[PDB]
Structure 1
Amino acid sequence: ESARREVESQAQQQLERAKHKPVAFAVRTNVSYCGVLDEECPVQGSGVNFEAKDFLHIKEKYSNDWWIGRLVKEGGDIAFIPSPQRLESIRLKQEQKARRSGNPSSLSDIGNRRSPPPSLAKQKQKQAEHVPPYDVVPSMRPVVLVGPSLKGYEVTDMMQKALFDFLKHRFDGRISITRVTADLSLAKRSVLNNPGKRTIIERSSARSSIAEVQSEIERIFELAKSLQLVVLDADTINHPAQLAKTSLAPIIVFVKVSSPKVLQRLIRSRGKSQMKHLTVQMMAYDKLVQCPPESFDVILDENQLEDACEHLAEYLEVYWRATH
């Protein structure tokens, strides 16, 4: 059959034609699969071996079955990533190799109860949660700083503003800094079809701040579409788990202190105003440090300003370089 060879050649030519075009968007993969093993790929032998919690950069459109993407890792070449429909099809194919999928067990009972598979055995049911196989995530993961005390208070304010100023000075002309006054912890996606479309209905949620939260969500999305690095100065995040399940899922940068005694002496050197909230700051620091480090993306145990600043510097540099 010359048709398969001809379509392979056409797809390849389109690949090197669009290799140097701007990227459209990006998504995240929450399932582990290999794009080289499947026989439905337009190009065979050039699949991507992505795993759970992986990111790809989609530039153009191919069909309702496959897309063209790029590996976020440094040196990643071109690859094909299946469409959400194709991913659902391969997920269904994953569990069809078993003896049974529905209710009728194969415990030495064959020929008596045929039990044809009902709708409960298919994907039509199980719609209570329906976690999407592909999520519309921002192209770049935003940079946020967490700890070691509450946001909006002195100790965290200085200890994060120093690093923000360092990043602004070192990345001049290629980075943008913005502050998100509105809340960001309620970045949900499957609450309702349209919660509070108009603000004049005077409903319970019409007069609330959900509209501002959503508007800031699309603002962050379109800002990340620009491919320019942007850090967040929002002072409404205080725990990795608050925004870990949301769509944004920012890069959590955790700064830590060896013992609470050092922090106690630090606030002891500030004044009585921070001494008043010393108790709540210690409580929040203890709660934040009880969390295992793997929840946070990067860790900063360095005592000195330089080591931490330059460390986040090469981390951001390699994140920028690997993306391109």
Structure 2
Amino acid sequence: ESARREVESQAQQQLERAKHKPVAFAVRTNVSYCGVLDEECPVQGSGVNFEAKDFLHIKEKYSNDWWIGRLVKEGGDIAFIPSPQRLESIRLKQEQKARRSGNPSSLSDIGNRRSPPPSLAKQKQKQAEHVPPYDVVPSMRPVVLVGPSLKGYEVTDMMQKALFDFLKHRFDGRISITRVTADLSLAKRSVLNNPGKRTIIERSSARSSIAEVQSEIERIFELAKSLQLVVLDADTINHPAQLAKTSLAPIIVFVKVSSPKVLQRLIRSRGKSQMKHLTVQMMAYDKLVQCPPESFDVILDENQLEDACEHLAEYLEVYWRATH
């Protein structure tokens, strides 16, 4: 069979002529599927088994089954990623390997009730949620600042003020810091076919902020498209949990101040503008410290401005180096 030999290198030549192809978009994966067990691919060999929460930058359009993308690790190369449907089709095969995949138990009952798999045993059902294996993510992971207390307060606005100042000087020509004053808590990947398309509807959502909530989502989306570092520092982010399920999936930087006693004298020295809500700062840290450590992407517990700055700057260039 000489047909396979020509098509095997047909992709090899197409994806090698232009090693500066623009990144069309990026996708995220969270399914433990082995691409080497199933010997089926445009280029035979050993495919890359990108694990959960690994970004793949799909920059080409081959067909409806497999797509070409690059990973976000250092020394990334050109790889292939099958379609989500294809993954849905091949995930259904995973339960096919068992003796039974529907209702009928095989507990010494064969030949009496065949019970072929009905539409309830296929992917047609489970449409109430039907969470897709693949989710839309921006070109690069946005970075937002949380902690060591609730945003908008004196110290918390002060800690980010010095931190964001360092990024623009160190990353001049590669970064863009923006400020958005609109809410972001109510932002899910699938809530309606067209949320608030018309503002003249005059309904429960027409007069709300949803008319402009969706507009800024593309603004962050278009900011990442221009190949630059984006910074989101809104007043509506106070915990990584609520933003861990949106489309953005950003980077969370943690500036933990270790013992809660420190925070106290940090706010006590400010002025009379602080003790009007002095006590809530403790529960502001308390409601934020209980989050599991693995949710945070980086930790900055250092007590010096300089050491924490170089700690974060070193991580961003690695992200910058990997995605280039």
Structure-1-length-normalised TM-score? 0.97
Preserved contact between residue 136 and residue 247 of structure 1 (Cα < 8 Å): yes
How far residue 91 of structure 1 moved from its aligned partner, in angstroms, is 0.6
Partner of 1:288: 288
Preserved contact between residue 46 and residue 79 of structure 1 (Cα < 8 Å): no
What do the CA deviations read for 1:57-106 (whole angstroms, capped 9, x no partner)?
11110000001111110012111111122111211111110000100011
Preserved contact between residue 187 and residue 217 of structure 1 (Cα < 8 Å): no
In the alignment, the residues of structure 1 paired with residue 272 and residue 247 of structure 2 have an alpha-carbon distance, to the nearest angstrom, of 40
How far residue 38 of structure 1 moved from its aligned partner, in angstroms, is 2.7
What do the CA deviations read for 1:186-237 (whole angstroms, capped 9, x no partner)?
2212111112211012111011101211111111111112221011121111
What do the CA deviations read for 1:162-206 (whole angstroms, capped 9, x no partner)?
010000111112111100111112221211111221101211101
How far residue 46 of structure 1 moved from its aligned partner, in angstroms, is 4.6
Work out the number of aligned pairs and report it: 324
How far residue 39 of structure 1 moved from its aligned partner, in angstroms, is 2.3
Preserved contact between residue 23 and residue 58 of structure 2 (Cα < 8 Å): yes
How far residue 20 of structure 1 moved from its aligned partner, in angstroms, is 2.2
In the alignment, the residues of structure 1 paired with residue 15 and residue 106 of structure 2 have an alpha-carbon distance, to the nearest angstrom, of 47
What do the CA deviations read for 1:40-64 (whole angstroms, capped 9, x no partner)?
2101125111111111111110000
In the alignment, the residues of structure 2 paired with residue 72 and residue 184 of structure 1 have an alpha-carbon distance, to the nearest angstrom, of 26
Partner of 1:300: 300
In the alignment, the residues of structure 2 paired with residue 240 and residue 298 of structure 1 have an alpha-carbon distance, to the nearest angstrom, of 12
Shift in alpha-carbon separation, 1:227–1:35, aligned structure 2, 3 A: farther
Preserved contact between residue 101 and residue 121 of structure 1 (Cα < 8 Å): yes
What do the CA deviations read for 1:8-31 (whole angstroms, capped 9, x no partner)?
011111121243211100000010
In the alignment, the residues of structure 1 paired with residue 240 and residue 60 of structure 2 have an alpha-carbon distance, to the nearest angstrom, of 34
Q: How large is the RMSD of aligned CA atoms in angstroms?
A: 1.1
Shift in alpha-carbon separation, 1:211–1:282, aligned structure 2, 3 A: same
Preserved contact between residue 251 and residue 297 of structure 1 (Cα < 8 Å): yes
How far residue 262 of structure 1 moved from its aligned partner, in angstroms, is 0.9
In the alignment, the residues of structure 1 paired with residue 71 and residue 36 of structure 2 have an alpha-carbon distance, to the nearest angstrom, of 14
Preserved contact between residue 143 and residue 252 of structure 1 (Cα < 8 Å): yes
Q: Which 4+ stretches in 1 moved above 4 angstroms?
A: none
What 5-or-longer segments of structure 1 have no aligned partner?
Answer: none
Preserved contact between residue 67 and residue 80 of structure 1 (Cα < 8 Å): yes
Is the aligned partner of 1:236 residue 2:217?
A: no
In the alignment, the residues of structure 2 paired with residue 71 and residue 193 of structure 1 have an alpha-carbon distance, to the nearest angstrom, of 31
In the alignment, the residues of structure 2 paired with residue 18 and residue 131 of structure 1 have an alpha-carbon distance, to the nearest angstrom, of 36
What 5-or-longer segments of structure 2 have no aligned partner?
Answer: none
- Higher alpha-carbon deviation: 12-21 or 77-86: 12-21
Shift in alpha-carbon separation, 1:61–1:114, aligned structure 2, 3 A: same
In the alignment, the residues of structure 1 paired with residue 71 and residue 115 of structure 2 have an alpha-carbon distance, to the nearest angstrom, of 45
Shift in alpha-carbon separation, 1:249–1:168, aligned structure 2, 3 A: same
User: 2:244 aligns to what SS in structure 1?
Assistant: coil
In the alignment, the residues of structure 1 paired with residue 19 and residue 133 of structure 2 have an alpha-carbon distance, to the nearest angstrom, of 26
Preserved contact between residue 27 and residue 135 of structure 1 (Cα < 8 Å): yes
In the alignment, the residues of structure 2 paired with residue 132 and residue 17 of structure 1 have an alpha-carbon distance, to the nearest angstrom, of 34
In the alignment, the residues of structure 2 paired with residue 127 and residue 284 of structure 1 have an alpha-carbon distance, to the nearest angstrom, of 39
How far residue 37 of structure 1 moved from its aligned partner, in angstroms, is 3.3
How far residue 161 of structure 1 moved from its aligned partner, in angstroms, is 0.9
Preserved contact between residue 166 and residue 309 of structure 1 (Cα < 8 Å): yes
Preserved contact between residue 35 and residue 80 of structure 1 (Cα < 8 Å): no
In the alignment, the residues of structure 2 paired with residue 22 and residue 297 of structure 1 have an alpha-carbon distance, to the nearest angstrom, of 27
Shift in alpha-carbon separation, 1:189–1:201, aligned structure 2, 3 A: same
**Identity %, equivalent residues:** 100
In the alignment, the residues of structure 1 paired with residue 115 and residue 173 of structure 2 have an alpha-carbon distance, to the nearest angstrom, of 66
Preserved contact between residue 54 and residue 71 of structure 2 (Cα < 8 Å): no
In the alignment, the residues of structure 2 paired with residue 130 and residue 94 of structure 1 have an alpha-carbon distance, to the nearest angstrom, of 17
Structure-2-length-normalised TM-score? 0.97
In the alignment, the residues of structure 2 paired with residue 38 and residue 224 of structure 1 have an alpha-carbon distance, to the nearest angstrom, of 35
